[PDB]
Amino acid sequence: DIIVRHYNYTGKLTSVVFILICCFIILENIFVLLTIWKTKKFHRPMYYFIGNLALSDLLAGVAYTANLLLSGATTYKLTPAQWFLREGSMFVALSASVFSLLAIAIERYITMLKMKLHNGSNNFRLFLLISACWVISLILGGLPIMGWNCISALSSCSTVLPLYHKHYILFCTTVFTLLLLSIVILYCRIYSLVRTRSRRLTFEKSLALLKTVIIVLSVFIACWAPLFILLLLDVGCKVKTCDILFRAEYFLVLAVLNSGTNPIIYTLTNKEMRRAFIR
Amino acid sequence: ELDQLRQEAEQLKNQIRDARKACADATLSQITNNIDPVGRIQMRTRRTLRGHLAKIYAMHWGTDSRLLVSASQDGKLIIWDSYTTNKVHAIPLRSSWVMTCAYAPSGNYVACGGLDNICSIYNLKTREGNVRVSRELAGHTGYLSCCRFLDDNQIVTSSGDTTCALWDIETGQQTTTFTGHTGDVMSLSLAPDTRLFVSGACDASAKLWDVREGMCRQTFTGHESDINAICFFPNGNAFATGSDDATCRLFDLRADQELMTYSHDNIICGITSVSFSKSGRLLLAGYDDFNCNVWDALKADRAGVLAGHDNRVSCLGVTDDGMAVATGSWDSFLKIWN
């Protein structure tokens, strides 16, 4: 009766369209994975990172699905362990997606930093980045069940997740802030490097790269802003005070649309992706 | 006078064509009609030789049937121990652009050539323990497309200047020059007795040359495009030519015209290399469609596919005992097949 107690004392007492949207996202990610698998020249580390992102946000497509269907009136049937597993699945999936974006940004920044002529297959760096992302995601996802949770402490408890510790929500928000800042700075430095290298050579790339960076960054920030604002707000709102915390499903919906439009942005911009996908 | 002479040449060509038609009572597809089919020929990759970085253009096995030599555009000529995939030698080539390589029958020398118009012979059995350039043969005005060893002292080379050459290695001069081709010669094949050799050129014809006399005994014209590969039959009384028109053709020296054609409707890419099995029953041909087919020489039916390369299959070789078949392709990997 932990869940019912916490929901009573925090105040908590349209799914079809969302699950169909997520199935469509799964379809996009399966298309991207099939395109990567079929094409032989795509078997190089950058497209491997793109496929890793596709797998990560695909798992965010299944897991969000699970969350959306296992929620509602049937969350009371769940035991606290099952509730924690349900929430951790979403946390680990979204964290894996964000870390996949971070890994892609890091790889692109390194490739822009080193000119080279043939980058080659540096499987060490790719394995290190992928392992780091997919291990940190599971870690952060597993902290609530390990003991950093709200059990027996209802005066420092989050409202949107009435069994997640407020300090842990603050920690997750801080981590997401760090990754968001890192991605912003990485893409800005990529654009700055390309622009300053182009302008110092006498006779475009800069405009197309600026358009791509603007599209990616604006989509990511706009889609992940409501959820981040909600996470910041819930700590500052005591239970039974802030009503907007109750309507927290739409922000996660926009996060899921971010997960789903990442395929679209990362396939439409790359001409080779379009040419391979059409055939 | 030129018009009269070319009319006489046309009359001679018509006489040759009439003689060829007269001595054709039955087709090869009729004698080799009731014989048992070869059946499905399936070969797996037993060894994969890694270490080349650029695209491979040629290879040659050698009499020992264990070592082999491979040439790639990275500028390295690598001798592989096919049994254990060990690299016996790695020779840094002076010119990175090589399109052919040969391994001497005795094994003491290895030859290479390419866009530099020079055939380099390297002494493998050096007292110093390294590999030194034993000889450099110059005189060709076109790229070397093929080269094969008669023995430790004589070599036959084909170049893009529409001529072939017979070199004495010790003196470094051309003992013989074979002329008559009107197009670039892309490959040559020596007979087992080393008394004759066939050269296929870009004039869509293959010419048979006598090594000793130095004259062109016969010419064969059945192809519709450039001839890229040629290979004698094991008995030396026939040969096979692969061309860019996606067809192979088996010719007979004594018959003097074409015997068989090897073609399929869904194959539209040219052939870069042909080779015969030990018994001569199977004709392995490397195509531009990333694959390598195994035709039945007698039945002209396809017998199997060697599809394990990710790029153009540039070179093909068969061991003298026929135990294994090595394919070298543009993806920088050699593959041994059994």
Place this chain on the structure above:
Amino acid sequence: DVQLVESGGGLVQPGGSRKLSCSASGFAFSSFGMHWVRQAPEKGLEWVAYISSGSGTIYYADTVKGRFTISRDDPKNTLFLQMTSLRSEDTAMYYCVRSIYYYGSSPFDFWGQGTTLTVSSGGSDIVMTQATSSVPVTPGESVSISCRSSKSLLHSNGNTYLYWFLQRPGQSPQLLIYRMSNLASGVPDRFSGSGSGTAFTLTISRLEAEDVGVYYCMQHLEYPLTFGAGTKLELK
């Protein structure tokens, strides 16, 4: 041509230290593995140390394990043997030998002249045995030198790792036959190797005056290399 010169030999008191230097010339030193081999004043050869090309692997004998250190300086083409805690049993002549290893190669092709060390006063390895100490032979005849091995020298790959060396009076050993069948470069076709398993024989046809000497039997299967007792060849 190809040559190896040994230096650094002299009178040493027991427990002292000494360094031997083999200077190579006329061949690609960096591509050849190097062996140090000992020959005591009256008895036969016995292998001491080995360092591969590029110093990848280093091997020692149990007699000199720990005390001896073999190294190579490729850019200056030199082979060093730093030996410490010298006992009186190490007084001998030392040879630096070149050996390259690939398919069809001939290891122990060339031997150095050797330098003299004068120190002033087991099991689990193949025991190569040459039962006959010497044979009286009249030149122009055919002589057979036998050999034996505790363990079979034939490997699963078809190669029998048996080497034959001839040490003329006052000269360094010369490689005659490598792998029991193949004849070394510059060796007259008179010499022939045969045998199988553990028993081997070396046959000489039409013996001539430069064939007199001691013939040594060496194994290369298991790396604790052991030479034969030797078979002296003398005229009547």
Place this chain on the structure above:
Amino acid sequence: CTLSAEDKAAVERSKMIDRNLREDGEKAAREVKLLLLGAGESGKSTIVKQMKIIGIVETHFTFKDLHFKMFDVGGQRSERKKWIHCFEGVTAIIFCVALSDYDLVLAEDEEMNRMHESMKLFDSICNNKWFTDTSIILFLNKKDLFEEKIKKSPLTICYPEYAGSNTYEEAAAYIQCQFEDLNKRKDTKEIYTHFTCATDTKNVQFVFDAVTDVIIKNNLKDCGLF
């Protein structure tokens, strides 16, 4: 381990050969590949001389910590389609055009205009199936000779449809446009046009920064940001 002592030593030798091959390949992959092409007397020789100052002939030079290989195939009297596939994957193609050839009739000896033959060769190599992505670096050599030729010899000899005036700027721009219009792979490749002369010294800088642009483009294609 079933290997013997000799087998182990052979494997060690093979591993050392592998380590040397990898080092050589890493050294080679940091080097720029340029395929030099052009018609007879186009100006390849003076381009080679400019590179030096700052069968097959190979030129090696260095600029701004980049090593440039330049393969002047030149006197290769053979069919181009039998060995042109060897040069795919080069960083760039350097095509030389002699402007003063716009009114020189002999081609090889066909008695059809040399500029037309140069345009035909440029079309053949630019639209070649092997060089579908390689960027051409077009050099309009002999601008000093053309600046005097165009004054007295109208461009209509080579281009009957030229409706512009007989000035250096207009005629030179017209010739550049005609050469660039032969490009049919507009999206996949770019053509870098530079107007060189006999005694100018900025040619190696143009090669350097054009190769830098090609490298930036290739990096963007590897990342997919382009």
Place this chain on the structure above:
Amino acid sequence: TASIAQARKLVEQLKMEANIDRIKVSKAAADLMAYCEAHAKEDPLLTPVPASENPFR
């Protein structure tokens, strides 16, 4: 008269090639078929050699 000399060379080469002894296609085909049949047993590509015999397994 380089063209005339080349034409004479071509004519004499054709005449040399036009006076060789040619056997029928049936004979030259039966010879190849019999050679393939005779050496069929010694071909390990035709019949797969056992794993205990080929060096590559």
